[PDB]
């Protein structure tokens, strides 16, 4: 059963084969 857990945990059958946080935030500071 542990070897089957290894099979499932690593997904050698590609269980997850098929599959809007933005890295940019902008801040306004105003006039110099």
């Amino acid at each position: 059963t542990i070897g089957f857990v290894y099979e499932l945990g690593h997904d050698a059958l590609k269980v997850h084969s098929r599959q809007l946080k933005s890295s940019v935030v902008i801040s306004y500071l105003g006039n110099i």
């Binding site: 542990i2 070897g3 089957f4 290894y6 099979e7 690593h10 050698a12």
Partner: protein, 53 residues
């Protein structure tokens, strides 16, 4: 080749699968454990060398 019957030996015959089952988990279960670890090595090994991690 000559063959005859026995009666005390034929009280409750086991099929060959039964006779194997009577000893392979009890008297010789070290072999079964050894085989299990060999099967476990094969599954982990064959997987590790073939599939993209």
């Amino acid at each position: 080749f000559i063959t005859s019957k026995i009666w005390d030996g034929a009280l409750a015959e086991n099929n060959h699968i039964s006779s194997i089952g009577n000893i392979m988990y009890t008297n010789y279960n070290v072999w079964l454990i050894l085989a299990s670890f060999i099967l476990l090595l094969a599954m982990v090994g064959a997987i590790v060398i073939t599939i993209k991690p």
